[PDB]
Structure 1
């Protein structure tokens, strides 16, 4: 894959020589042998100019959700113009009746056998 400056990639390793696996950064430089990634670190936040080979780097899908939500909201607004687009946390479940006719409650007897 042709990585480009400013892209967001995930530092995934395939012994260690360091412990930066699972951290995400933005590409600042690219060359044939390796791709340059900058990772922010606290001392105020400092920065590290990491350089890694393409073998241990992959694109990050973190911004996919943002773009998808933006497009969906735009489409919904356009359709409704003919709105409550805000995301909502999982609301508590409402009351519902349960029927034991098809399933008799069994005392599992934690023995269990």
Structure 2
């Protein structure tokens, strides 16, 4: 309690090492808008549309964009319930999220696998691997490549 806005300055709001005034051209230009997921990250430079403490490093969907503002739907736990909150943030604060990129790459790769299978009229599964239990194997070992271990005396 006794809780003003930016409390925990030395914690979260502390800048990344040697990162001052970073404002280069590529930062702005991403454009996926109303469907997109987006991370909310603090910028050392920009104080103007800085979020509240809780929203740091969190991710949520963009629901509205303006000139250099972004509305973001973020989940917050409020005691007994997780609820969706309309977080207004700025363009400098929003970072494009990468979860979508994992889904998309998998969709593209699977689609290529599906397309290949379809051309052959094959019956095969495009589902992800489980990283299952290792099968049987073989190695040939000369006396030179095998080392005898034992515990160590104090030294």
Using the TM superposition, name which of 15-24 and 43-52 deviates more: 15-24
Q: By how many angstroms is 1:49 displaced?
A: 1.0
Q: By how many angstroms is 1:108 displaced?
A: 6.2
User: Hey, which of these two has a bigger chunk of helix by percent?
Assistant: 2
Q: Does 1:18 align with 2:53?
A: yes
TM-score (norm 2): 0.58
> Could you say what the CA RMSD is over the residues aligned between the two structures, in angstroms?
2.8
TM-score (norm 1): 0.75
Match of 1:92 in 2: 133
Q: Which runs of no fewer than 5 residues in structure 1 stay unpaired? A: none
> Helix, strand or coil for the counterpart of 1:92?
coil
CA gap 1:75/1:105 in 2 versus in 1, 3 angstroms: same
CA contact 2:38–2:60 (8 Å) conserved in 1 = yes
Match of 1:31 in 2: 66
Q: By how many angstroms is 1:28 displaced?
A: 1.3
> Helix, strand or coil for the counterpart of 1:86?
coil
> Helix, strand or coil for the counterpart of 2:147?
coil
Instruction: Count residues in correspondence.
Output: 113
Q: Does 1:72 align with 2:109?
A: yes
Q: Which runs of no fewer than 5 residues in structure 2 stay unpaired? A: 1-28, 45-50
> Helix, strand or coil for the counterpart of 1:39?
strand
Equivalent of 1:9 in 28, 32, 38: 38
**Structure 1 CA distance for aligned equivalents of residues 102 and 153 of structure 2:** 47
